[PDB]
Swiss-Prot record:
Phosphoserine, modified sites: 166
Subunit: Can form homodimer. Binds both upstream activators and downstream substrates in multimolecular complexes. Interacts with TAB1/MAP3K7IP1, TAB2/MAP3K7IP2 and TAB3/MAP3K7IP3. Identified in the TRIKA2 complex composed of MAP3K7/TAK1, TAB1/MAP3K7IP1 and TAB2/MAP3K7IP2. Interacts with PPM1L and PPM1B/PP2CB. Interaction with PP2A and PPP6C leads to its repressed activity. Interacts with TRAF6 and TAB1/MAP3K7IP1; during IL-1 signaling. Interacts with TAOK1 and TAOK2; interaction with TAOK2 interferes with MAP3K7 interaction with IKKA, thus preventing NF-kappa-B activation.
Name of this protein: Mitogen-activated protein kinase kinase kinase 7
Signal peptide bounds: none
Linked residues for Glycyl lysine isopeptide (Lys-Gly) (interchain with G-Cter in ubiquitin): 46, 132, 183
Active site per UniProt: 130 (proton acceptor)
Expressed in which tissues: Isoform 1A is the most abundant in ovary, skeletal muscle, spleen and blood mononuclear cells. Isoform 1B is highly expressed in brain, kidney and small intestine. Isoform 1C is the major form in prostate. Isoform 1D is the less abundant form.
Species of the source: Homo sapiens (Human)
Residues reported to bind ATP: 16-24, 37
Part of the full-length chain shown: 27 to 303 of 606
């Protein structure tokens, strides 16, 4: 039951916490713990209010619950779920969990399953618009991934002006024209796949303010190829990055390809438990994938 909430019913706890600072706050409403995401500019408010119905229909195991929305001030009220942002699991403070290729592929598959649900909704698709590890949450000992924030429709001017911190994942057609489409979420997904496999921050070698990243990828820069990555994976990855959005897979294609490939990645249900000690080397290890692949096909 998605509701139209009165802001008076909200008691805000702290502005500092796990979510996007200055957009997302942890608060309480009714008796429940919630996350309040304020919708900032007028362009974003217009696009957000129009799609409240679709949001009220969202229900999926890889998306946090959405309790409702407020219309003054415009904001989305969602479930505050316990866990760690995928960003901090990957790149956070130095005592970090160890994870395997199976986990990497399982997280990306789950991401695609939630986004495919979004894209397939009828009559009108819901486009996520801002897929990135800060907006994904790991729960159940790091084995289940959930989308915990939704993107907004930002005007062209704003990309170089109000760093929302999405530059490394932003499709070039979003930078130049704010052409949010299914293919923009697919581009972000391809970047995230590179990021979890290498455990590296995309476009980290580009200093300057955030917008230098968006100019780099708009000029065609991409993350480096990954040493010894399975060619089915590399093909999916680089097709996702394409400048031409039509040359990019759909989210349903991605779900099916990745579901297939999970047969070569057993053990994704093992909880995270241990700490851990040109082209780029992968963080994860594909040796088991190659062995299992040959068991299926020979050399």
């Amino acid at each position: 039951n998605f509701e139209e909430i009165d802001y008076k019913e909200i008691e805000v706890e702290e502005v500092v916490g796990r979510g996007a600072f200055g957009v997302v706050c942890k608060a309480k409403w009714r008796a429940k713990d919630v996350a309040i995401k304020q919708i900032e500019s007028e362009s974003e408010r217009k696009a957000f209010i129009v799609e409240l119905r679709q949001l009220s229909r969202v229900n999926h195991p890889n998306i946090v619950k959405l309790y409702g929305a407020c219309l003054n001030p415009v904001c989305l009220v969602m479930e505050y779920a316990e866990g760690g942002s995928l960003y901090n699991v990957l790149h956070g403070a130095e005592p970090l969990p160890y994870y395997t290729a199976a986990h990497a592929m399982s997280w990306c598959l789950q991401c695609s399953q939630g986004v495919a649900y979004l894209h397939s909704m009828q009559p009108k698709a819901l486009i996520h618009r801002d897929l990135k590890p800060p907006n994904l949450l790991l729960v159940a000992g790091g084995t289940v991934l959930k989308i915990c924030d939704f993107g907004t429709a930002c005007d062209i001017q704003t990309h170089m002006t109000n760093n929302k911190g999405s530059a490394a994942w932003m499709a070039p057609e979003v930078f130049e024209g704010s052409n949010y489409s299914e293919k923009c979420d697919v581009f972000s997904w391809g970047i995230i796949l590179w990021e979890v496999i290498t455990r590296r921050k995309p476009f980290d070698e580009i200093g300057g303010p955030a917008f230098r990243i968006m100019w780099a990828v708009h000029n065609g820069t991409r993350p480096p190829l990954i040493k010894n990555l399975p060619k089915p994976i590399e093909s999916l990855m680089t097709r996702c990055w394409s400048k031409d959005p039509s040359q990019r897979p759909s989210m349903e294609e991605i779900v099916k390809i990745m579901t297939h490939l999970m047969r070569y990645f057993p053990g994704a249900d093992e909880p995270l438990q241990y700490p851990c000690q040109g082209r780029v080397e992968p963080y994860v290890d594909f040796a088991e994938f190659y062995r299992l692949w040959s068991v299926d096909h020979g050399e």
